[PDB]
Amino acid sequence: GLMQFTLPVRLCKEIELFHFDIGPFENMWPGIFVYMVHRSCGTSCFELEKLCRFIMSVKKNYRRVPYHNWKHAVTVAHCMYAILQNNHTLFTDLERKGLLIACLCHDLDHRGFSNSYLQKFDHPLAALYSTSTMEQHHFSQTVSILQLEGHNIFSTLSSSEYEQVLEIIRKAIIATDLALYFGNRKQLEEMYQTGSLNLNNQSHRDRVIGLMMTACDLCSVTKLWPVTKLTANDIYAEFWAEGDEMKKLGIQPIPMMDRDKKDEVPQGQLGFYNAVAIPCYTTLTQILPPTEPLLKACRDNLSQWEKVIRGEE
Ligand SMILES: Cc1nc2ccccc2nc1CCc1nc(-c2ccccc2)cn1C
Ligand SMILES: [Mg+2]
Ligand SMILES: [Zn+2]
């Protein structure tokens, strides 16, 4: 009960900032996450024994892929932690419980391959889940782990509160499908500008949560430039491996996944920042003003990629 997690001074201070990097010490990441649950949610939110056993089952069910790994899950949970802590009163007890867990579980059992590659390979998961293939699997894996003996961290919730939290986590995880992000932000942009956005409307809350999930999922772009640049190597390591597997299926991959076209990465990043990242944090900043530091960091990194192209680095 009176057992709090306490980080070293530098981590205790920097964990509260949006651009925090969780560091290369794998064995500290569970403690970092439990710390965030306790400050964001409360010490009474979860049974410490159940939570610790849930976290270690989640970790085990992430694979040794360059990017879609345990570090990403914890990194995405931290961005959500920083959003929730800067937006104290805007979110319910069930939401702050569910969203940190959703982020931690959002890429469970990822193979480093896209929905597109699973489809063209004709992978069994593509038969089971025709759209948002991996994201339906990520939620399936989340339910499975929650049903392991001694793993149900929501056991003290009522039948109706339990159904509500799993519904938040399902929508939250499905929203990390970037194919769905474009339509969701366009609808949020329309609602904000015409002034019809209403945070008491449950269908509106779902869309805002969904945009928060995209913002946390893409948060690599909101880090200090060295972290952003080095993370980009891991991201393209997965894409190029997928490009290799496309060629093996007798399909030329898109330039993004073709390692022969490494030279075009800097321009590919500008397109992504202008098409996806900058619009995402702009709409999020409009709806939740205290998330402005993500937009600012994202813009700082867009300028850094423009310098790369101009041969200044
Ligand atoms: C998807 C994606 N998601 C990210 C999430 C977080 C951080 C960085 C990310 N970068 C990308 C890749 C962006 C991208 N690269 C190219 C391209 C690269 C070389 C040659 C040709 C094209 C095209 N597009 C769209
Ligand atoms: Mg994913
Ligand atoms: Zn992810």
Structure determined by: X-ray
Query: Which atom of ligand 1 lies closest to the CA of 255?
Result: 21
Q: In 3D, which of 76, 85, 95 has the Cα closest to residue 33?
A: 76
Q: In this structure, are residues 281 and 294 in contact, taking their beta carbons and an 8 Å threshold? A: yes
**CA dist list (Å): 182 to 39, 114, 232, 267:** 32, 17, 22, 21
Write out the two tokens for 250. Answer: 């007798």
DSSP class of residue 89 equals: G
Q: In 3D, which of 257, 256, 259, 253 has the Cα closest to residue 270?
A: 256
Q: Spell out the residues 6+ positions from residue 132 whose beta carbon is closer than 8 angstroms to its own.
A: 115, 174, 177, 179, 180
Q: Spell out the residues 6+ positions from residue 223 whose beta carbon is closer than 8 angstroms to its own.
A: 19, 21, 231, 297, 301
DSSP class of residue 253 equals: P
Cα-Cα-Cα-Cα dihedral sign, residues 75, 129, 121, 60: positive
**Whole-angstrom Cα distance, residue 78 to residue 91?**
16
Does residue 22 have its Cβ closer than 6 Å to ligand 1?
Answer: no
What are the two backbone dihedrals, phi and then psi, of residue 286, each rounded to the nearest 5 degrees? -55, -50
Does residue 218 have its Cβ closer than 6 Å to ligand 1?
Answer: yes
Write out the two tokens for 269. Answer: 């990043």
**How many CB atoms lie under 10 A from the CB of residue 64?**
7
Q: In this structure, are residues 218 and 176 in contact, taking their beta carbons and an 8 Å threshold? A: no
**Whole-angstrom Cα distance, residue 55 to residue 52?**
5
Query: Which atom of ligand 1 lies closest to the CA of 221?
Result: 7
| Ligand 1 center–CA 266 separation, angstroms | 9
123 is in an annotated binding site: no
Does residue 237 have its Cβ closer than 6 Å to ligand 1?
Answer: no
Examine the residue annotation and report whether 68 is marked as an active-site residue of this protein: yes
**How many CB atoms lie under 10 A from the CB of residue 149?**
6
Does residue 227 have its Cβ closer than 6 Å to ligand 1?
Answer: no
Does residue 266 have its Cβ closer than 6 Å to ligand 1?
Answer: no
Write out the two tokens for 178. Answer: 């970037």
**CA dist list (Å): 107 to 73, 169, 178, 200, 203:** 7, 12, 13, 29, 24
Instruction: Estimate to the nearest angstrom the gap between the alpha carbon of 103 and the chain centroid.
Output: 5
> Side chain identity at 18, as an amino acid letter?
F
The burial of 247, by beta-carbon neighbours within 10 Å (0-12 exposed, 13-18 middle, 19 or more buried), is given as middle
Does residue 277 have its Cβ closer than 6 Å to ligand 1?
Answer: no
Q: In this structure, are residues 134 and 110 in contact, taking their beta carbons and an 8 Å threshold? A: yes
Could you tell me the resolution of this structure in angstroms?
2.2
Q: In this structure, are residues 40 and 83 in contact, taking their beta carbons and an 8 Å threshold? A: no
What are the two backbone dihedrals, phi and then psi, of residue 152, each rounded to the nearest 5 degrees? -80, 95
| Ligand 1 center–CA 268 separation, angstroms | 5
72 is in an annotated binding site: yes
**Whole-angstrom Cα distance, residue 218 to residue 13?**
23
Q: In this structure, are residues 295 and 219 in contact, taking their beta carbons and an 8 Å threshold? A: no
Which protein residue's CA is at the shortest distance from atom 4 of ligand 1? 218
Place of tokens 């339509």: 183
Q: In this structure, are residues 280 and 189 in contact, taking their beta carbons and an 8 Å threshold? A: no
Which protein residue's CA is at the shortest distance from atom 16 of ligand 1? 268
**Whole-angstrom Cα distance, residue 95 to residue 81?**
12
Residue 109's region, left for phi above 0, alpha for psi from -120 to 50, else beta, is left
- State the CATH architecture for 28-310: Orthogonal Bundle (1.10)
**CA dist list (Å): 36 to 48, 150, 166, 221:** 13, 22, 20, 21
Helix (H) or strand (E) holding 83: helix 70-86
- Output 257-264 pairs: Cβ under 8 A, ≥24 positions apart: 262/236
Q: In 3D, which of 231, 234, 259 has the Cα closest to residue 245?
A: 259
Query: Which atom of ligand 1 lies closest to the CA of 228?
Result: 7
Domain limits of the chain?
28-310
107 is in an annotated binding site: yes
269 is in an annotated binding site: yes
**CA dist list (Å): 70 to 35, 40, 46, 118:** 17, 21, 21, 21
DSSP class of residue 117 equals: H
